[PDB]
Amino acid sequence: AQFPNTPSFTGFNTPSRIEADIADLAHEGTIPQGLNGAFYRVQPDPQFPPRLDDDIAFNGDGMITRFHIHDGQVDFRQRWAKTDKWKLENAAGKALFGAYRNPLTDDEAVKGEIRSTANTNAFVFGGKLWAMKEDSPALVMDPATMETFGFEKFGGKMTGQTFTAHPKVDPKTGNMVAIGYAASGLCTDDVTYMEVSPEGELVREVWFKVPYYCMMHDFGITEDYLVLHIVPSIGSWERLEQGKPHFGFDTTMPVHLGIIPRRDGVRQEDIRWFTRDNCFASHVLNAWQEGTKIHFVTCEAKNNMFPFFPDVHGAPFNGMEAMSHPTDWVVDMASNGEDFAGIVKLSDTAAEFPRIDDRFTGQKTRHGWFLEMDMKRPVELLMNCLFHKDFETGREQHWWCGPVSSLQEPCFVPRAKDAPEGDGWIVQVCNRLEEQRSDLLIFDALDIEKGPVATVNIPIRLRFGLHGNWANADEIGLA
């Protein structure tokens, strides 16, 4: 196939499209014997050249990578997420769906079809592997064979059109907590709040409305609440009719924070909204309650972080104002009015792709891990450091991948099911950009600054990844 000669399909973005198996990858150092499970991650990877002259990275078909770590070795398996899109285009021999989140650029033959690329998260829950994309139901797969089952509509009990790619698991109940925005159609202000039992059943689905339609990419949960940030990366049908990127950023609009009680029969009037001045925030580290306060830790930038979803008023992209920092948004359920109680910058380190020890989701956490952009480092060819913060001592650790590499999202793996918070490992893919290959790095999570304890060579160049997760062998049929 002939792909376009553009930055989205060349260099680091050259198409790969590899399905593969490798046993016992070559490595340096010591792979911890204590690791027994698998790290799943997803890369957008176009099956076909795009319908339009160009495309963006968020729009490639989801390709799922699994690193099965056991007995001191790492095995590699990679397979397509066989979405309806993937199947339809595979049969036609060509692209049928068009631009990102824009059905007006699709072939008439796929009108009304689910558009998901399942390319944003690879998540294990309830014995299934979930390949997720926030414009559609999630695609469920077999975590062991990595075959595709199909889209999860919960037998038809799901009434919304969409399902998040940033699900959260409630440690108290074991439920998956999810939202689905644009729930009644593209660009609508309807959102569902959903919980899924460990058994896979949709046990709650609550419809509500948000102040305005926007990219509701992530959210937080607390013991009693779902915490939803409303950030003005906005879209509209008018944008799509005109061929603009679906989203653009409006610096003139306020940011809101919605507090949704996690209970049955929640009404619109039960939801509380707080309001602050414009900023950009996408990913949520964690959120928790303290007394009457809710703490909501996100990575906040002064302005838009997506150059390909541009400023709606024509402004050129401002790299400096896209630097994000871990920030606590604090609201007080006992106050009157909409003002935030506090907006507290927690580090001067520029950081994104935040992660916690997910066993403590919705509770006060001591540790966070991030990708860091350290603009003071040499670059001889961009997230170039792993960053850990101990929020109780304030101590920060940094590990630099060197001047010819970059890093993908870290994932925390507990040492044992009863281990203290953060007692375990970080795994992450490293892009060896000059050598055109990839490594899987393994760190001691509380001592990242000494460097990885193992470097596992991947003889396939991996593409830009989005989100990834660990599951123990007994959760994925590999025990």
Ligand X SMILES: Oc1ccc(/C=C/c2cc(O)cc(O)c2)cc1
Within residues 258-287, the interface with ligand X by CB under 6 A covers 282-283
Please report whether residue 466 would count as binding ligand X according to CB under 6 A.
yes
Ranked by CB distance to ligand X, the top (closest) residue is: 282
Rounded to the nearest whole angstrom, what is the least distance from the CB of residue 177 to ligand X in the complex?
Answer: 19
Residue 217 CB, nearest approach to ligand X (Å): 5
Residue 439 forms beta bridges with which residues?
Answer: 430, 457
What phi, psi does 81 have (nearest 5°)? -80, 105
CB of 58 to ligand X, least distance (A): 4
User: What would the x/- binding string for ligand X be over residues 58 to 77, using CB under 6 A?
Assistant: x-------------------
The one-letter amino acid at 160: G
**To the nearest whole angstrom, how small is the minimum distance from the Cβ of residue 33 to ligand X?**
34
Q: Which of residues 43, 78, 120, 327 is near ligand X by CB under 6 A?
A: 120
Which CB sits closer to ligand X, 190 or 409?
Answer: 409
Size of the site for ligand X (CB under 6 A): 9
Q: Which residues are annotated as a binding site for Fe(3+)?
A: 166, 217, 283, 467
115 touches ligand X (CB under 6 A): no
Of 352, 358, 372, 409, which lies in the binding site for ligand X, with binding defined by CB under 6 A?
Answer: 352
Smallest distance from ligand X to CB 146, Å: 21
Q: For residues 236 and 372, give the distance between their C-alpha atoms in angstroms, rounded to a whole number.
A: 33
Q: Extract the annotated binding site for Fe cation.
A: 166, 217, 283, 467
Q: Based on CB atoms, which residue is closest to ligand X, 166 or 262?
A: 166
- Smaller CB separation from ligand X, 148 or 162: 162
> For residues 308 and 400, which CB has a smaller minimum distance to ligand X in the complex?
308
Min dist CB 80 to ligand X, Å, is: 17
Q: How far apart are CA 390 and CA 410, in angstroms?
A: 16
Three-state SS sequence of the chain: CCCCCCHHHCHHHCCCCCCEEECCCCEEECCCCCCCEEEEEEEECCCCCCCCCCCCHHHCCEEEEEEEEECCEEEEEEEECCCHHHHHHHHHCCCCCCCCCCHHHCCHHHCCCCCCCCCCEEEEECCEEEEECCCECCEEECCCCCCEEEECCHHHCCCCCCECCCCEECCCCCCEEEEEECCCCCCCCEEEEEEECCCCCEEEEEEEECCCCCCCCCCEECCCEEEEEECCEEECHHHHHCCCCCEEECCCCCEEEEEEECCCCCCHHHCEEEEECCCEEEEEEEEEEECCEEEEEEEEECCCCCCCCCECCCCCCCCHHHCEEEEEEEEECCCCCCCCCEEEECCCCCEEEEECCHHHCCCCCCEEEEEECCCCCCCCCCCCEEEEEECCCCCEEEEECCCCEEECCCEEEECCCCCCCCCEEEEEEEEECCCCEEEEEEEECCCHHHCCCEEEEECCCCCCCCCEEEEEHHHCCCC
Question: To the nearest whole angstrom, how small is the minimum distance from the Cβ of residue 301 to ligand X?
Answer: 9
Task: Report which of 150, 3, 11, 77 is spatially closest to residue 433, judged by C-alpha positions.
Answer: 11
Pick 175 or 233: Cβ nearer ligand X: 233
Please select the residue that binds ligand X; options are 305, 351, 445, 476, rule is CB under 6 A: 305
List residues forming the annotated binding site. Answer: 166, 217, 283, 467
CB of 352 to ligand X, least distance (A): 5
**Cβ-based nearer residue to ligand X, 164 or 175:** 164
Nearer Cβ to ligand X (217/388):
217
Residues 2-61 touching ligand X, rule: CB under 6 A, are 58
Out of 41, 77, 217, 389, the residue judged to bind ligand X by CB under 6 A: 217
- Verify binding: residue 196, ligand X, rule CB under 6 A: no
Which one, 62 or 143, has the nearer CB to ligand X?
A: 62
Quote the least distance from Cβ 478 to ligand X, whole Å: 28
Q: Which is nearer to ligand X, 175 or 324 (CB)?
A: 324
Residues that bind ligand X (CB under 6 A): 58, 120, 133, 217, 282-283, 305, 352, 466
